[model samples]
Target chain A: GSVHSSPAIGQDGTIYVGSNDHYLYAINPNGKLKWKFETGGSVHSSPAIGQDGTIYVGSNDHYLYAINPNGKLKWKFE
Target chain B: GSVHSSPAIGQDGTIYVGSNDHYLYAINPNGKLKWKFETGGSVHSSPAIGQDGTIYVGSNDHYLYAINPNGKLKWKFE
Candidate 1:
């Protein structure tokens, strides 16, 4: 259970963090688990928020993910 | 070969990031290297800036470093 990544807070207080558990997690401001997106490898890259509400993060899988504000994958680049 | 830490931007547009290369880099707005400070271990923790212009970051070496704006070591915590 490794979690060396930093969490990015959105304007709405949504928390986005990556874990060596191989997932990108979205947590509610209330400390509830909102959603999680799995990756093929450890996710150590911290997420960056765009002005347009897109979340960008990287994985050891050699991919960059763009997640929407709704906790859905908008796109990913390998 | 990794850079899992997030970069923090100072009010003056300086970029600070940690690298698994066991260093913390300060880059100018022009994308040029301003300075680098070596750490005892991989630097995976993202840097945070204080209003007073102090840079704080963590190292796998189990210490936290407080660096001055002039690229000098202000203090460190074990």
Candidate 2:
């Protein structure tokens, strides 16, 4: 099974992908797990990244998440 | 009603998309069908295009396909 969101390769080779298990994962090039963020519900929506390294994706929980490049929280668009 | 694979734009602006309908579609800039390819089963995989205009996608149909830019069959990866 696959998430609705396809994994994206960032300019720096960071891989970004969401999961139905309610988390977003960022992996380094060496296949090492970088980090992940928990969401309210299943994240079936696809991810769209901004030019500023801002990540935008929706969740079945009925909210959108905007995360920064450092894996820090920026804001949530409900 | 959507495939897991996201549509991709070619340098010539052709759009490539796969469907559970057991076929891959190529649409022109005007949304006209350029061609299609038949596959075995449901296609829930994402597509990645090569610089050579070759298209790559996976299908639960238990195989991977490599089609030329013209929609002609190149080969299959089982």
Candidate 3:
């Protein structure tokens, strides 16, 4: 569980969230794990889901990550 | 305008955003101003729209505001 983050729900109801674990998690509506991506530092930044299903979020690592719906790193902003 | 805030769209397509202008703005789907509510300081935090259409946002003024869809202040927490 995260200390100061909330989940963002996608159009399809997929849940995305960040945690102090330094990871972004994609969980299904059934509460099952879908996937996760690691970051360099704690992730208190909440995820923002785009219309196209891309996930945008920031990291204490001093960068913003863009992850595809499948959990692949699309790009990052430093 | 804002430096680090994004807009959250309500189910009704109302766009809610916070700005450094120390105001929380609600823009309609057609890009027209629906309403605006002033806060004590710059509003750098992004807005979150609850399912019931309540907007929740924060300000550098050290308060968290809960605003109604009609741009009325419901409550604020310091």
**Number of the predicted model whose TM-score against the real structure is largest:** 2
Task: Specify the poorest-scoring 10-residue window by lDDT in model 2 chain A.
Answer: A1-10
- Clash pairs for candidate 2: B5-B46
lDDT of 3 by residue, A1-72 (tens): 346467899888999988778898999999999999998876665677665667776666755566889999
lDDT of 1 at B74: 97
lDDT of 2 by residue, B2-78 (tens): 65356888889998887878787888999889998888865565655655667766555655466789998876643
Q: What lDDT tens digits, residue by residue, belong to model 2 across residues A1-78?
A: 543345555667565666667987665544467888899887666567799889888887888999887788788887
Local distance difference test values of all predictions, in order: 0.78, 0.70, 0.75
Number of colliding residue pairs in model 1:
0
Better model by lDDT: candidate 1 vs candidate 2: 1
Ranking according to lDDT, highest score first: 1, 3, 2
User: Which residue runs of candidate 2 sit more than 4 Å off their true CA positions?
Assistant: A1-4, B1-4, B7-45, B48-78
DockQ of each: 0.13, 0.12, 0.08
| Candidate 1 Cα misplacement greater than 4 A, ranges | A1-43, A47-78
Q: Which candidate do you rate higher for TM-score, 2 or 3?
A: 2
Residue A29 miss distance in model 3 (angstroms): 0.8
lDDT per residue for candidate 3 within B8-68, as digits (tens), equals: 7677656566656687777654446788899988876889878788899999999999998
